[PDB]
């Protein structure tokens, strides 16, 4: 397995002009490994009982040596997982990477779905108000089929049984992640990476000396920033309301998911029909999947240059990003008619600019 | 990867496993070329970066103006107008 | 003495590549000159076409031996 190590991470030859925007994959992998370490060492002291989970998490912070550090590293590294993934996705929307990296793009989408599931399962385990009512909402959202929801819950309502199986599932999924990562990289190195210029070039250079050092530099920056936020708390990434014990008969008066879930939340606020809600997610994900075979949707021969530099027309990916940010903004606010109106405007933009990527 | 007519080798010595990726991506040097490199122990390596700073920065910033900033300005506009609409609503609906 | 490379890439002259590598030496009159004359001999030489009576794969010279056993060919 050493010979493979050398073939793929030492003698592998890249293009000279790979700048930082091509370093974020490595970064998400590293946040995965790190999150796994802190996960396992958190599991050694966590209690999976509805009667006492909350106090179990508080015991780590209050009465255990370095107890606070692992919880906070685990909490904060999640945000960086998602931030790095979104940068990593947008880079390849910008470049039209999926033109020839077909199966890599598919694998990517599967990994993103895995990550969403993993995060949301994690989000229930500390067992506060937000955890209980979030679980209630998302389980009610997948109700269309009889008996599936009491079965997956384990029970007529969110329960200790639900906590136990969420804990086991959150244990298992990351490692399935890892396996799919190996699959991802297989498809990638089958083809070879693209340039920022989107041309084919013979001016290649080996990995170990030049690109490995850039990977290391960015890694230093990321470790830095994680520790900064973890130790000092600069930003209010997580809302305070998960600090309150659960009550099964009273909701919290103000509700804000974790930031990486706000856009979705915005949709659930503005579309009238609940099924329309769910279908928007399904449709957008199907549209992203459809990009894998964009070469077939037209008989003009395709190029990777999108000529977005100096261009007054901008590009659909940029409009997508700004629409998504606008949806995050509206996600965060209270339900009111005007917020809903601009919500619907932004939602139409978000859907249309995704549909239109296929129309070259 | 490379087309089959590019990855056809002139030599016949067996490719060692640790060089797999190297020869899957073989390409011909049509016309040949000459190259020169200096050992990094005999080069300045932080002065060349700052010496060419202004040119690089002009290029990068020029390239991103229209595509990233102008839609940004429009979006910022929209947020300000939304705030206006809300702060007027909240009085119309609930203040006598 | 400058540490640099000067490579002439050419794929229209057959399968064989030629190379030379150099280090900084010592003057004629240096005390260590003799030792240098010896080190040149410790590394020695090899030809695949014409070999004397010792097979390269069993030679006493370890550099020749390592070269002749690479990938068995």
């Amino acid at each position: 397995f050493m010979s493979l190590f050398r073939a793929h991470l030492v003698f592998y030859r890249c293009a000279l002009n790979l700048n930082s925007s091509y370093n974020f994959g490595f970064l998400v992998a590293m946040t995965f490994v790190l999150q796994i370490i802190t996960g396992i060492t958190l599991a050694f002291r966590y209690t999976s009982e509805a009667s006492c989970a909350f106090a179990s998490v508080q015991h780590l912070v209050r009465e255990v040596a370095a107890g606070w550090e692992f919880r906070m590293l685990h909490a904060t590294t999640a945000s960086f997982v998602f931030l790095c993934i979104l940068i990593h996705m947008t880079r390849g929307l910008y470049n039209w990477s999926y033109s020839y990296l077909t199966t890599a793009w598919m694998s990517g989408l599967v990994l993103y779905l895995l990550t969403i599931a993993t995060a949301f399962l994690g989000y229930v385990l500390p067992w506060g108000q937000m955890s209980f009512w979030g679980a209630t909402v998302i389980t009610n959202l997948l109700s269309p089929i009889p008996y599936l929801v009491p079965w997956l819950l384990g029970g007529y309502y969110v329960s200790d049984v639900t906590l136990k199986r969420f804990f086991v599932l959150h244990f298992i999924l990351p490692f399935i992640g890892c396996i799919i990562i190996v699959l991802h990289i297989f498809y990638l190195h089958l083809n070879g990476s693209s340039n920022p210029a989107g041309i084919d070039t013979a001016l290649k250079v080996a990995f170990y000396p030049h690109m490995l050092m850039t990977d290391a530099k960015c890694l230093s920056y990321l470790i830095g920033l994680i520790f900064l936020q973890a130790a000092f708390g600069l930003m209010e990434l997580s809302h305070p309301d998960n600090s309150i014990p659960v009550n099964r008969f009273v909701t919290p008066l103000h509700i804000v998911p974790e930031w990486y879930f706000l856009a979705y939340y915005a949709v659930l606020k503005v579309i009238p029909s609940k099924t329309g809600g769910l279908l928007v997610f399904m449709s957008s994900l199907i549209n992203l999947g459809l990009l894998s075979e964009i070469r077939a949707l037209n008989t003009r021969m395709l190029i990777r240059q999108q000529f977005m530099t100096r261009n007054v027309v901008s590009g659909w990916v940029i409009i997508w990003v700004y629409s998504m940010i606008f949806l995050i903004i509206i996600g965060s606010a209270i339900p009111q008619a005007t917020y809903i109106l601009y919500g619907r405007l932004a939602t139409i933009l978000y859907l249309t600019t995704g549909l239109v990527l296929c129309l070259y | 990867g490379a087309p089959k007519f590019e990855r056809k080798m002139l030599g016949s010595y067996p490719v060692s496993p640790e060089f797999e990726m190297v020869w899957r991506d073989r390409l011909t040097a049509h016309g040949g070329y000459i190259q020169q490199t200096i050992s990094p122990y005999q080069l300045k390596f932080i002065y060349p970066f700052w010496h060419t700073f202004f040119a690089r920065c002009w290029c990068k910033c020029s390239a991103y103006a229209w595509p990233w900033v102008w839609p940004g300005l429009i979006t910022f506009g929209l947020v300000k107008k939304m705030n206006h609409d809300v702060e007027e609503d909240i009085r119309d609906h609930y203040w006598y | 003495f400058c540490g640099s490379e000067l490579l002439h890439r050419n794929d229209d002259m057959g399968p064989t590549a030629h190379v030379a590598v150099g280090f900084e030496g010592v003057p004629w009159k240096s005390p260590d000159a003799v030792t240098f004359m010896l080190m040149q001999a410790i590394v020695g030489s090899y030809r695949k076409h014409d070999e004397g009576i010792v097979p390269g794969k069993v030679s006493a010279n370890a550099t020749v031996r390592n070269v002749c056993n690479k990938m068995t060919v």
Binding site: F1, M2, S3, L4, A7, H8, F186, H189, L190 | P14, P17, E20, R24 | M71, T72, V73
Partner: peptide, 18 residues
Amino acid sequence: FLVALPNLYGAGGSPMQA
């Protein structure tokens, strides 16, 4: 073991046919 799995693509090969 540390030199297992010599290839990731292709058809492999055998030492006796070099």
